[PDB]
Amino acid sequence: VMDVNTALQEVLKTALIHDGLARGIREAAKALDKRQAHLCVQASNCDEPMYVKLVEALLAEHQINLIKVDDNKKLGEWVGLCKIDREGNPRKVVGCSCVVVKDYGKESQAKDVIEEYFKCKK
């Protein structure tokens, strides 16, 4: 399970240092409605059902992959949406709830989401 979660860690890291990936609900909607977006990542600890039924029901009608992570806070720490000093707060913000990767930057570690799509089609 390390070789998939750390894998999309590296994927979103190279995506955000190479370009801008959409962070937050409005940019996520406006980025995946356009027909270039790669997989979405969204949290599991959401407290309201219309938010989650919106995001899954609106990504499933597209042809885009989905990976679900348990907490939004630690995800937001992962997605670079913070002011991380190496001796202070890891995540001083309420973390992000859903992102979408517009571009990977390069094809170094695309095999992880390739086999992710394989087991999704399994």
Partner RNA sequence: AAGGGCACCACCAGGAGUGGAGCCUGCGGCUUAAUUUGACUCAACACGGGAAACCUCACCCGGCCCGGACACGGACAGGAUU
Binding site for RNA (CB under 7 A): 23-27, 45-48, 72, 76, 81, 92-98
Q: How far is the CB of 66 from RNA (least distance, A)?
A: 15
CA 20 – CA 48 distance, rounded (Å): 28
Q: How far is the CB of 121 from RNA (least distance, A)?
A: 28
Q: How far is the CB of 8 from RNA (least distance, A)?
A: 17
7 vs 52 by CB, closer to RNA: 52
Residue 67, amino acid: I
Strands (E), the chain: 22-23, 40-43, 66-69, 98-100
CA 44 – CA 21 distance, rounded (Å): 20
71 vs 108 by CB, closer to RNA: 71
Q: How many CB atoms lie within 10 A of CB 84?
A: 13
27 vs 115 by CB, closer to RNA: 27
Q: How far is the CB of 119 from RNA (least distance, A)?
A: 27
Among candidates 78, 85, 120, which has minimal Cα distance to 101?
78
Describe the chain by its helix, strand, coil percentages, rounded to 5. 45, 10, 45
